[PDB]
Symmetry: C3
Amino acid sequence: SKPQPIAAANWKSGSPDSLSELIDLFNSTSINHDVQCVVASTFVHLAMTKERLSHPKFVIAAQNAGNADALASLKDFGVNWIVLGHSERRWYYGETNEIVADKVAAAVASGFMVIACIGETLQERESGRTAVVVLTQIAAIAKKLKKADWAKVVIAYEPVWAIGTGKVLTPQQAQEAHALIRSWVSSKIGADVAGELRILYGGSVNGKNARTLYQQRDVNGFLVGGASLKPEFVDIIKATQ
Amino acid sequence: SKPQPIAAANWKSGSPDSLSELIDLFNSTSINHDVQCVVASTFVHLAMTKERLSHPKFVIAAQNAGNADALASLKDFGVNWIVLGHSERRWYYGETNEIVADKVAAAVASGFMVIACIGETLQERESGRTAVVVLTQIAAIAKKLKKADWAKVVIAYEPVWAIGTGKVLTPQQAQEAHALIRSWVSSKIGADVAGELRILYGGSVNGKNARTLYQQRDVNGFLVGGASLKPEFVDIIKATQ
Amino acid sequence: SKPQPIAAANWKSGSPDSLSELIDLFNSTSINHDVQCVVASTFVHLAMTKERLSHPKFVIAAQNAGNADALASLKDFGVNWIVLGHSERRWYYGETNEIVADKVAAAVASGFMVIACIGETLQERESGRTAVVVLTQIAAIAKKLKKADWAKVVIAYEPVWAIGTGKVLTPQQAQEAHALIRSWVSSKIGADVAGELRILYGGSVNGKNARTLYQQRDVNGFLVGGASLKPEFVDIIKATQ
Ligand SMILES: [Cl-]
Ligand SMILES: [Cl-]
Ligand SMILES: [Cl-]
């Protein structure tokens, strides 16, 4: 068995029109297994997904929160999930491992479910440094969490060089990264926490490659950017069965 | 998403014949979503529903308990759900807000799931006092509970003037009452409790009006009298999908 | 209505060949209700079930842990469920009620889900001593458990004389034994624990007798030896719906 999977859409563009039709598609889709679906977006789409996205298996999420005022206003707005630490926050805007970890801790304290992102750059991968970089990232997050807080955290493992580039990990490479992360959590945090933790893969997931990725033992679902703007996101949800 | 919905039948009359047949209908019906179905009754039906109602989605409930002796004997009989504060207990039998609150707290402490009923009269509605009356009712219940106890409480909001009269709230009216209650629970008890709380509507729910009521964001299912004595109760269950 | 059922395969014989095909059968079977399926085996099959058994409703289990070192190595190997107290461990290998009880508690402390077996011999049954024997067995287990531990325990009631002999309890007999056990747990441990406890039946369960056994109120599934080596195990899983 695995914990409950997550199928998360990450909307980083799109037309208003294109995306309320996607919400209507999601609302009309039959999902017959236990999966938590998530639609993360900016303020552009959140009033609409809060109101319009009716499917029982879906929740909405914010894509980021800059400060404590924003965390509190998003919660009061009705948002209970948030993505933190995503790719560009770290490498384009300069958030350190510790700033990401404090944001995760603050969000958990405020009552969010948090999708905390980790992942290595092209150079870190090719120079053999994936394990050291990614385990350093998650270690910083863990330093700010108490044992019981892990029930509110989800890890998204995303190679930076796979996000939006058409370069996806092979099933074996995804499984090796996720098994590494799982082993670190089990040793440092506990087998109980490791077995309940969702570790999602993201980085060019699409409806054709999702099933074989999901079949890997340590993959618990996906964080999906480009393919979540398209009807194939429904098949990515189906791939988590 | 919403918390787990409840479809609760409230059996206040009727032939043992037609009710074994109804139990057999329920037992044979396919329900393929997460919903807690409940059949509340008086002693007339409780031995039968305890033995005969076998559907995995169903539980039995007592329709009231007058005192601690009855609570204790119902629990030993095998009953783990109870309805308290229902319409007539308050306005015909004189149970005040405080009396109902003490009964709810006693039942929770004894291990029951409690469907605690609140709701305004025709005159209170028409004179603009719904909110003050209903929030005063739930505030009295909350006074006798600790935060943790809310995991064992369900609120049933039922306008007294809608019970048994064929006068149902419109979807919009139901949603405004439920959003009001939800807001109070969030502000006074906690956003965490508010997100998990089931707030059920009752008052002339039937198989034709249930779906558009359940589509409302703050409606988590139903307490159903007259229509729960008929086969259309299965369509009310289906309306919570 | 009932807690989550369990359909557990207890593999005590079978070829590599035969059993990998069975895992493939289980992997391709559609299971459309909430049930925890378990495949318990010795070391002969555990690397294979760990890797190959991919169905979301299945977990693997070990058949015995002889000491603390074995419990730790099994957990580190990835086994999270274990069968303890099974008939031959008691009557052939001499494990007393207390040895079994201490193993149950040690496995729970090590992070296992435990299927703890109890049951009477032919002579105990015929001489009228089933209740004293079986309740003495479970009282010994309970002495070594804290209340929170029961969430990690499953009871398997198996008449020793029914294991592997083709003699199965009738539905009424199984229900009386399970109602006896349930009444003891409710009175000595608590109604809350009793209502959540899975009490499985085992002893010559097969694809033809499983449904009427599962229809009994206090039966929560099965521990299956011979018939779990055959394709009819899938019909035993279906019988828990
Ligand atoms: Cl890169
Ligand atoms: Cl009225
Ligand atoms: Cl025997």
